[PDB]
Amino acid sequence: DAAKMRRFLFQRTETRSTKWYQIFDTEKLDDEQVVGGHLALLGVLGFIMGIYYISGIQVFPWGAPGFHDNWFYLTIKPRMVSLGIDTYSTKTADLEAAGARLLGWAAFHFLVGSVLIFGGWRHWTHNLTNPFTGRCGNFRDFRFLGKFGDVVFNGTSAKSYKEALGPHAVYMSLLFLGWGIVMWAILGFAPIPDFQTINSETFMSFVFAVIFFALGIYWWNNPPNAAIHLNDDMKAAFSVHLTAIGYINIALGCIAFVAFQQPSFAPYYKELDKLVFYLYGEPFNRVSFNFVEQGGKVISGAKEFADFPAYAILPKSGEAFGMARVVTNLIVFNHIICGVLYVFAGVYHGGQYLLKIQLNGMYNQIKSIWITKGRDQEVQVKILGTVMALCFATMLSVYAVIVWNTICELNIFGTNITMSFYWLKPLPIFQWMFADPSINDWVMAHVITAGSLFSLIALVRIAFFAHTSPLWDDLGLKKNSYSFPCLGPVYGGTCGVSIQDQLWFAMLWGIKGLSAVCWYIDGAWIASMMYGVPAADAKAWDSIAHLHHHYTSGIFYYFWTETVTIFSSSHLSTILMIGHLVWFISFAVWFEDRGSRLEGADIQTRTIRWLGKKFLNRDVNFRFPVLTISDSKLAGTFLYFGGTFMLVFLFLANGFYQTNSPLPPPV
Amino acid sequence: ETRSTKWYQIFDTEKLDDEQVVGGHLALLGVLGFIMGIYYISGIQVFPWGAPGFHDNWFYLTIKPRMVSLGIDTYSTKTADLEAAGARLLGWAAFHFLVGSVLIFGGWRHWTHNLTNPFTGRCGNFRDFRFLGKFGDVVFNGTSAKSYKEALGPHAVYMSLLFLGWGIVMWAILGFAPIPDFQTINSETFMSFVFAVIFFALGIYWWNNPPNAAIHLNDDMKAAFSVHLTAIGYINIALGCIAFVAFQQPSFAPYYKELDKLVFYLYGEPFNRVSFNFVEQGGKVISGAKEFADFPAYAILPKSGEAFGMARVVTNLIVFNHIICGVLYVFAGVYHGGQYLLKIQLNGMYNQIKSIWITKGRDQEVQVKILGTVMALCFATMLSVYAVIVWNTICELNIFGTNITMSFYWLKPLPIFQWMFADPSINDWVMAHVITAGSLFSLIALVRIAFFAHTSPLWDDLGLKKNSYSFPCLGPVYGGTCGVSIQDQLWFAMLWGIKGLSAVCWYIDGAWIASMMYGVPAADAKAWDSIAHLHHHYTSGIFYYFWTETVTIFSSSHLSTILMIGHLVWFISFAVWFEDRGSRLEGADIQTRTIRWLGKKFLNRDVNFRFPVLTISDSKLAGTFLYFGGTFMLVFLFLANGFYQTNSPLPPPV
Ligand code: BCL
Ligand code: BCL
Ligand code: BCL
Ligand code: BCL
Ligand code: CLA
Ligand code: CLA
Ligand SMILES: CCCCCCCCCCCCCCCC(=O)OC[C@@H](CO[C@H]1O[C@@H](CO)[C@H](O)[C@@H](O)[C@@H]1O)OC(=O)CCCCCCCCCCCCCCC
Ligand SMILES: CCCCCCCCCCCCCCCC(=O)OC[C@@H](CO[C@H]1O[C@@H](CO)[C@H](O)[C@@H](O)[C@@H]1O)OC(=O)CCCCCCCCCCCCCCC
Ligand code: SF4
Ligand SMILES: [Ca+2]
Ligand SMILES: [Ca+2]
């Protein structure tokens, strides 16, 4: 039975094979299918966007009660208020009129989404036939909306990616102009060019439509020759776009933090502090053990509050819970974690293409300064050498400051908070970047600098060591593959050497700076691991450094304070248990025990065969499966990263509890 | 033949003889006496000359109820009766310094085979000796034990002699006559003589007839040392179990329960604080503001023993210590034992051993059936009890339209077992099944070490042998083969053991185990005490344990430093336990070249360092040590933060 048993392990091996999570890969799809897939998802995205609109209705058009508050719509409510579809009004009439508008935009997105899905099926199946005029169209050569195509594109379509830039830019100016008309005609916002009103978003919707159209014609006549090697392969271009989109998303996250709490954005974001929100899963009106409410009601029982019915979600004061910043932290963090994730994948899917060329030898044939200036091994170890040195001199300079501040605050080794770095704060030149600048701001800048250079090491290694490294050229070895776990025990072992594993060590290392953001935007103290504890000098910070605000907690005391509100909620606490349960299970597949599970699975499948035969008359052969290391490090990073930030949501959605009253010394 | 020149294998049984072992054991009991004499000096509350004594330390708290029981230490609140106590502790500390110095001298010469005494000018023989002159001649027919089996009788005799000596010491020096009633310390002298009679009689029966059981254990030092460690660990677990039931018996109240009534000043505890502008002068405080104003500046503040619950904190620190070790020694006994089963399978003495402790598991057929029963029972129990805890958590959080009425509040230990618990409740039914599941879980890693040290039913299928005990894996072949050696199976017993090693910490700190969430301000978390008529209010639930217990940890500037250090140590184990060993080897190469390049350009002289990286087997070693040490550096904080269970339950909030 050895052979049959081996045909199975062979059915689950570390060698190249087809996997369910690689079927929509760029390699097996032509350029007509990428366009078709993007269209079908935007149709689904419109269907999704139309559900975030129906959910926002508080009172239905017929006047009856609607939906309870939910986080999906909350992150978009300040935008629909800004555009006039949604309105913050106590009057039930405004609440009933508003609901009709959201329902109308939801049905509209249902119609347009259905068109994009239809226009995404025919493109995918190359069945792009006009149902009215029997004649079909050509992807390579088409008129592009008839007469409009002839005047601007000389009646021709782009045959190469570098050419598609001009037409794509022209298509963008038709959206910039298209939105500038929707705002003017449907939403009633005329283009007044003053940057304190929503009317400025129509004026710049036309300025941008002019810049892009002019820029889209210059690239039609003069397509850029930069990164020509990308025009040859889809994944090469798709990865540079993803490395670019991630920095774009991080930028969007950073401006939505500065802007959403500007005075001009007060009518939409700060305005929320004066609203009562019934969030789902929040503590409801409790009832007694012997509580039976019959037709007569309130008989032979008792209930909590008595100002609301049994099992009804209780109100929540926006000012107390800090709703404004909670929403501002949920949007800013979303576009930052995603931005970081996009950058990591751009480098991964990019080095995934650098491996394909090194194997085929096209690497030495590239002429772009974007690859040529990076094929020298001496130059690589210099770039990586400086990145590692900078990462070290900055992770040790800022960690020792945080540790020293912690030691001074806890009076360890007879040291008072006076000897700590309370005098160190950002220089005067940078003081404009921060409100009430302090050591909490000097540390955060250096932590992000150290947290970027740390995860950059794993990225420079994907870019430079996809096929070979100075060590494996020394050890005479080839990295044939992007997802190979290790070469075995040899040379003290060589686990985690592929670029997919280096991607994992960028996501795992990126959890620190991805947490220095969560902690810093929630008004937490980052200069000390212990701030505000009932101990020696933790509460002396607000007056030793003269801070205008009072931070919620320090790195360690953050978990205790922020979770007082999590434990009070029956749903925020379910996330705390699920999120922790998912995270530890990563250790089972990330620890070097893949072999043990396999011999264990053998005993599992042997015992089941034994029990089934001794009890029943049938033969139970299930051949218990076990994941491979590369398949383990995959699921391991998804359980680790995916459970780590299932709970970061709880820190941001539990409320914003930074104040404006610095504490006096606990003298 | 895998290398064994590592620094942590220097004192291996292979590198030592029977004479050296005796020397090694003696060279430590002398050190242990030196240690025991420091736990005595530190416990001086007031010096003999009248100068103030030493602030409370945890090393002396776990022995103070014993020295009080023996009369060396007193609980008296008066300095006059507390000034004598100090003199006594000095007497026994100096005494243990003298006896320790003798045992080290009698260990240094034993270790160097130099058994010569200057006064008698004659060198003794290890192979044969009279044993304390005529006494041994009458009992051992003028001869000494020639083997481990023949050493049982003489070794048992020595135990009887030691017991008799302790009894004489209690009667003559400590003044406790042997009265045979089991509510007084005087019964520890009566049974010190009954045991000295049982052992002496038992030590003669084993000298005349040496035991033939486990005959192969005589042949190898590690084979016998491992069976002793599998036995000593179980003994230590039993001592921890017994000390929990006994230390809070009515007869032990004068020593353990009495701690509550005292005021303790532990080092590193909250002290009288001062203002930033504080300028203390000899005579008085000037232009300064100091908190409390009842003690001097920077003076440790008092702590009410009753609020702290020191009688149960000290009981836990001792009970858990002899259990954290008892299970570590059971794991090491199987490890060092399977470490010997690898050698007899490599040099092939296994098929010829007639011992039923090796012959019983000879055939692979039975091995799969034995491991298939440990594995099936662990599944049917770790699931039956986890689904109860999860269901109880769901019912009280009112998730999926359920209430605390639908929970497992009506499930509790059967009437036959109710005597085992002061207050029976689902918290007790779950704990018994969690320990049962937590033992069968880590037993799987132990049955593996015993049966699959060299070859498994899978490796025999894959045509492979496990040549070593500390081989990380066989490469990425067959999808991967990592963590297959018995040293790695030892790690997966220590790592898996952390759950039952935590179900004890939680359950002895008076926490709830029948629900992840107990006592939180949610729908039915606070409705437990009345739905099940609990006579006690458990401190918190499995998850809410971390929030409540840590309110006292954050208030202490030293208990919080442990929290930080303990967490820092633990996550670093991820660096050496993740499959990133190949990545570390490359990275270091860049660091060596980078440092060489920086030194080259920066200084005319070129200096290189060749940065080193640990091996996987050397990684999984430092990994388990960082994971285990980190995980129980902080379990200490749960036990030493106070015992906060109360005997008053909470009514439903409604
Ligand atoms: C998560 C960390 C990495 C990541 C790691 C990986 C890994 C690991 C793999 C891919 C693979 C793929 N990646 Mg990638 N990838 C990320 C971000 C992206 C993004 C993006 C949203 O910006 C896109 C469009 C892509 C695009 C793609 C395709 C080229 C390819 C096959 C997809 C597939 O079949 O999925 C599965 C199809 C489904 C319908 C399942 C649901 C997928 C949803 C739609 C998300 C798509 C992106 C996601 C990471 C795909 C892989 C999921 C696996 C569980 C890892 N990646 C980030 C940066 N990517 C595979 C490949 O061939 O690489 C050369 C591969 O092995
Ligand atoms: C920690 C988990 C395991 C454990 C795992 C290991 C591992 C792993 C190794 C040993 C090894 C040894 N073990 Mg063991 N061992 C444990 C418990 C014990 C106990 C006990 C206190 O009951 C004893 C007496 C021993 C005895 C010994 C020796 C036979 C041998 C060499 C010791 C040495 O040089 O240490 C180092 C000497 C020092 C002076 C350092 C300080 C050591 C102190 C005194 C504690 C001794 C026990 C400790 C586990 C030794 C190893 C420390 C390493 C860092 C792992 N083990 C528990 C059960 N043991 C080695 C061997 O050859 O095994 C075949 C080996 O590779
Ligand atoms: C949102 C709409 C989606 C889309 C969804 C559809 C739909 C819907 C249909 C097609 C179909 C067609 N698609 Mg398409 N497709 C898109 C993008 C493109 C692009 C491109 C790279 O810009 C090209 C060259 C094509 C090519 C083609 C035509 C050759 C084909 C013609 C039959 C027909 O009814 O034609 C009329 C169209 C033409 C003769 C081509 C010239 C006009 C433009 C290019 C048509 C697409 C819509 C236009 C861009 C929308 C407005 C954009 C404004 C900026 C707001 N599509 C746009 C972005 N595609 C047909 C099909 O599959 O039938 C089964 C079809 O009915
Ligand atoms: C607590 C003391 C320690 C110890 C510490 C010492 C010391 C101290 C000395 C020796 C030395 C000797 N050890 Mg030794 N050794 C121990 C255990 C043993 C055992 C054993 C397996 O029981 C044996 C056979 C030996 C063998 C020997 C003698 C042959 C040798 C003789 C020179 C001398 O001065 O002798 C007098 C002793 C004898 C002639 C042997 C017969 C008497 C017993 C066995 C001696 C040991 C002390 C005795 C057991 C203590 C009281 C036990 C009560 C229960 C309290 N030791 C005991 C348990 N060993 C000597 C040495 O190394 O000199 C450089 C020495 O001075
Ligand atoms: C909750 C976590 C968890 C669970 C259920 C298991 C379970 C198991 N492990 Mg693993 N393991 C874990 C964590 C866990 N481990 C971690 C963190 C590590 C790293 C140290 C390891 C390392 C590891 C090794 C090295 C090996 C295993 C092996 C095994 C199996 C042998 C025990 C057995 O037969 O029955 C035990 C009893 C049960 C499984 C009863 C079921 C318990 C519950 C009901 C399971 C369902 C709950 C689950 C979490 C649901 C997920 C919900 C989702 C939202 C996440 C068993 C399937 C061995 C094996 O044979 O591999 C196949 C083996 O060699 N364990
Ligand atoms: C605090 C934890 C910590 C620290 C300091 C490091 C540091 C390092 N890692 Mg590691 N790593 C960690 C956790 C950590 N890692 C974890 C949890 C994992 C698992 C995901 C990994 C996985 C891992 C891989 C896979 C790789 C490394 C690599 C590296 C090195 C490359 C970065 C560099 O050159 O300078 C970074 C900057 C510094 C080191 C500055 C120093 C920072 C402080 C001051 C260090 C001293 C504090 C320390 C905790 C003191 C201990 C006190 C004691 C009580 C515990 C670097 C030495 C790479 C390498 O080259 O290996 C050699 C590599 O391939 N990391
Ligand atoms: C994967 C690894 C990386 C993870 C991803 C990191 C990307 C995020 C990128 C950092 C940006 C964070 C984003 C949120 C924006 C935000 O916060 O902006 C406002 C402002 C403070 O606002 C107020 O915040 C309150 C909260 O407590 C205060 O109380 C108050 O006093 C203060 O005024 O913050 C800064 O000025 C930003 C500091 C960081 C400074 C950046 C320095 C980096 C620049 C140099 C080079 C770095 C890159 C090196 C190469 C890799
Ligand atoms: C590591 C790998 C595996 C883990 C196992 C190793 C550790 C085991 C170390 C024993 C741990 C015990 C700790 C100290 C003993 C102690 O507690 O004894 C008293 C008593 C309750 O006392 C009071 O405790 C209060 C605290 O809340 C309560 O409120 C109150 O109501 C109650 O009366 O406990 C029992 O009766 C013990 C329960 C467990 C029952 C044992 C069942 C196991 C027996 C069957 C087979 C198991 C083995 C299977 C084979 C491997
Ligand atoms: S345990 Fe995994 S990562 Fe480590 S050497 Fe073996 S196969 Fe490679
Ligand atoms: Ca918060
Ligand atoms: Ca406690």
Side-chain angles (χ1 to χ4, degrees), chain A residues 39 116 119 122-123 127-130 137 142 144-145 171 174:
Chain A
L39 281 189
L116 263 56
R122 283 212 185 265
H123 268 261
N127 189 359
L128 73 170
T129 180
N130 188 296
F142 59 88
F144 172 42
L145 278 181
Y171 191 98
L174 272 56

Side-chain angles (χ1 to χ4, degrees), chain B residues 601-636:
Chain B
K601 187 159 188 162
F602 276 89
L603 311 180
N604 188 17
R605 294 183 181 277
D606 315 329
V607 175
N608 64 34
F609 181 58
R610 291 275 214 198
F611 281 91
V613 175
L614 307 194
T615 59
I616 302 169
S617 80
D618 189 359
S619 295
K620 304 202 204 173
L621 177 77
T624 304
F625 269 57
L626 283 167
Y627 199 90
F628 213 82
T631 299
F632 292 99
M633 194 176 302
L634 310 156
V635 158
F636 167 57

Side-chain angles (χ1 to χ4, degrees), chain A residues 583-643:
Chain A
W583 173 88
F584 82 81
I585 294 169
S586 63
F587 301 164
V589 293
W590 250 114
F591 276 18
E592 293 145 347
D593 46 36
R594 200 281 164 164
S596 174
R597 294 145 50 189
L598 187 52
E599 52 185 342
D602 205 275
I603 308 301
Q604 281 165 20
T605 188
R606 275 185 202 279
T607 305
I608 296 301
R609 190 181 312 156
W610 158 45
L611 293 174
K613 258 196 175 174
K614 279 210 67 188
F615 297 135
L616 295 174
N617 216 13
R618 283 191 163 283
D619 299 338
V620 186
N621 54 352
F622 158 56
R623 296 226 169 269
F624 280 86
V626 175
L627 307 194
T628 61
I629 298 100
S630 80
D631 189 359
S632 298
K633 304 203 204 173
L634 177 77
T637 306
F638 273 47
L639 291 169
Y640 197 107
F641 205 93

Side-chain angles (χ1 to χ4, degrees), chain B residues 45-69:
Chain B
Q45 271 158 45
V46 175
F47 289 121
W49 45 94
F54 287 90
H55 299 263
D56 295 328
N57 60 6
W58 287 113
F59 294 83
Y60 177 78
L61 291 175
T62 61
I63 71 185
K64 184 174 199 75
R66 173 61 166 171
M67 317 296 269
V68 168
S69 183

Side-chain angles (χ1 to χ4, degrees), chain B residues 407-462:
Chain B
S407 74
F408 283 107
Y409 77 93
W410 64 268
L411 177 75
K412 64 179 180 180
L414 290 188
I416 307 179
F417 297 90
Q418 282 173 346
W419 67 266
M420 293 177 70
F421 308 107
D423 179 61
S425 57
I426 177 70
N427 191 41
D428 288 331
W429 181 98
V430 168
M431 169 67 174
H433 292 72
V434 161
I435 291 309
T436 317
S439 303
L440 295 162
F441 190 43
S442 181
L443 183 65
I444 292 168
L446 295 183
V447 179
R448 270 154 94 93
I449 300 195
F451 290 167
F452 307 151
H454 192 229
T455 59
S456 160
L458 184 82
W459 283 28
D460 184 64
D461 272 335
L462 299 190

Side-chain angles (χ1 to χ4, degrees), chain A residues 2 5-6 9-10 12-14 284 286-289 304 381-382 384-386 388-389 399 406 410-412 417-418 461 465 469-472 474-475 479 485-489 491-497 501-502 505 508 512 529-530 533-537 540 543-544 556-557 559-561 563-564 567-568 570 573-574 576-577 580-581 583 587 589-600 602-604 606-607 610-611 627-629 633 640 665-667, chain B residues 271 273-276 289-291 368-369 371-373 375-376 386 393 397-399 404-405 448 452 456-459 461-462 466 472-484 488-489 492 495-496 499 516-517 520-523 527 530-531 543-544 546-548 550-551 554-558 560-561 563-564 567-568 570-571 573-574 576-587 589-591 593-594 597-598 601 614-616 619-620 627 652-654:
Chain A
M5 194 277 283
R6 282 193 310 274
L9 283 60
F10 290 161
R12 264 267 180 194
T13 189
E14 276 285 81
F284 59 99
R286 287 165 276 185
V287 296
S288 64
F289 280 99
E304 202 168 89
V381 182
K382 277 190 186 184
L384 195 49
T386 291
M388 280 184 181
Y399 188 60
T406 303
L410 288 185
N411 298 24
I412 311 302
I417 194 167
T418 286
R461 288 163 67 133
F465 314 137
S469 161
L471 177 63
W472 282 19
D474 272 335
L475 299 190
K479 299 181 180 180
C486 46
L487 285 191
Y491 299 97
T494 50
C495 295
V497 296
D501 289 345
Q502 294 287 313
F505 305 142
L508 292 169
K512 305 300 284 208
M529 293 177 182
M530 294 284 173
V533 305
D537 276 351
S543 65
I544 188 61
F556 267 82
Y557 182 75
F559 297 93
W560 188 85
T561 64
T563 312
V564 182
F567 278 126
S568 50
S570 162
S573 84
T574 291
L576 205 73
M577 289 186 309
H580 281 99
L581 165 70
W583 173 88
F587 301 164
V589 293
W590 250 114
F591 276 18
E592 293 145 347
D593 46 36
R594 200 281 164 164
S596 174
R597 294 145 50 189
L598 187 52
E599 52 185 342
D602 205 275
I603 308 301
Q604 281 165 20
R606 275 185 202 279
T607 305
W610 158 45
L611 293 174
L627 307 194
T628 61
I629 298 100
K633 304 203 204 173
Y640 197 107
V667 186
Chain B
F271 64 89
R273 288 171 281 183
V274 288
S275 67
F276 305 116
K290 76 170 184 190
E291 193 193 28
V368 172
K369 287 184 193 193
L371 193 42
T373 308
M375 185 179 288
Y386 188 60
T393 303
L397 272 191
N398 300 19
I399 309 287
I404 198 150
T405 290
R448 270 154 94 93
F452 307 151
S456 160
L458 184 82
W459 283 28
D461 272 335
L462 299 190
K466 315 171 171 176
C473 66
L474 287 192
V477 63
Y478 291 110
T481 44
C482 295
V484 174
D488 292 341
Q489 294 287 313
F492 305 142
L495 292 169
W496 295 353
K499 302 300 284 208
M516 296 271 173
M517 297 278 171
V520 291
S530 65
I531 191 66
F543 263 79
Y544 182 75
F546 297 93
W547 188 85
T548 64
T550 311
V551 182
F554 278 126
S555 50
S556 159
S557 163
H558 173 254
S560 84
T561 291
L563 207 70
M564 271 184 302
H567 281 99
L568 165 70
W570 167 88
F571 84 82
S573 64
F574 294 169
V576 292
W577 254 115
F578 277 24
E579 297 147 356
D580 51 29
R581 169 34 168 81
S583 168
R584 291 154 57 202
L585 180 69
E586 293 177 350
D589 196 327
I590 309 294
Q591 300 171 23
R593 296 169 160 279
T594 297
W597 157 63
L598 279 184
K601 187 159 188 162
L614 307 194
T615 59
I616 302 169
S619 295
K620 304 202 204 173
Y627 199 90
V654 303

Side-chain angles (χ1 to χ4, degrees), chain B residues 63-75 176 254-255:
Chain B
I63 71 185
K64 184 174 199 75
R66 173 61 166 171
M67 317 296 269
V68 168
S69 183
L70 304 175
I72 296 90
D73 187 57
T74 176
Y75 277 145
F176 298 113
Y255 322 108

